[model samples]
Target: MPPTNVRDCIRLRGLPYAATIEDILDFLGEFATDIRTHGVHMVLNHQGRPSGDAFIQMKSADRAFMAAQKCHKKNMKDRYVEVFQCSAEEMNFVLMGGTLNRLE
Candidate 1:
């Protein structure tokens, strides 16, 4: 079952140039904790261009919901970020939705 309170989200445009997976993970980890005091796991969309988008998984439904409400439509590093409610499978789809090959 998907997280009831915790919703999945993806970061959009305004990512730092040449941002790395570690950077994304760190950001999600911090954000997740702030939302629910729980940890979050993140996966990068290796198939996309510029590669700033990511899928975040929360430890629980409540956390996910809280995150969605609190963090949605917010900014990261001064850049506008978008958060959406999605399942793990859906997140995988987005992560691998494109035809572009992994850069590295």
Candidate 2:
């Protein structure tokens, strides 16, 4: 997201605050074989605790969809994570406004 050419990205909601960047990558590891790197990790919530919402980026548009299909609604840390395909531009907007900030 921050380093790539604006290929593909995803938003994940309902994740637990304990979730970390490594947790996200590991969760998506078995999928998105075409993906080479993680663009950015924007965790929503800041003040005292985090809301556990975040964005994940992939290499291409199609891969984003593919990853989301396999990841959406999957239970993680006892909560079903909501994964959806979005654009880098969308990530920027959400990171700036939509419950976006830092987690943990």
Candidate 3:
């Protein structure tokens, strides 16, 4: 079953620049029950290259809280990564769907 609240999320960084959403799908394991991915919205540079940072929305804030710490210091394709607890503001945009705030 999915998380009860369904608005959870975590901001992950240090992705292997070449990583696609599927790559992180595997990375998001074990704790998958607490997470129901809206999707991994990868950030891109002005040149349209992968930025190595992505915002992943889980099912609920409570689940997000649970998934946060343990995801850190883990490897993503051999490159260790950083994970963050999302802010309320980030959650708003994240769940809004269809687009990311692509900063240049």
TM per prediction = 0.53, 0.72, 0.68
Worst 10 residues of 1 by lDDT: 35-44
Cα displacement (angstroms), candidate 2, residue 45, comes to: 1.1
Q: Can you rank all candidates by lDDT, best first?
A: 2, 3, 1
**Better TM-score candidate (2, 3):** 2
| Native-referenced Cα lDDT, model 1 | 0.53
lDDT tens readout by residue for model 2, 1-104: 36544648888778776777677667777554565465657574657455767777776778788888878887775778888888877888777776656787
Candidate 1: count of backbone clashes, pairs at least 3 residues apart or interchain:
10
lDDT of 3 at 46: 72
lDDT of 3 by residue, 1-104 (tens): 65233446677778887776567778877666555555456777678876667776666677676667877767777898888778546755554553866798
Error of 2 at 10 (Å): 0.4
Candidate 2 deviant stretches above 4 angstroms: 1-7, 32-38, 98-104
RMSD of each: 7.1, 5.8, 5.8
Best by TM-score: 2
TM-score of 1: 0.53
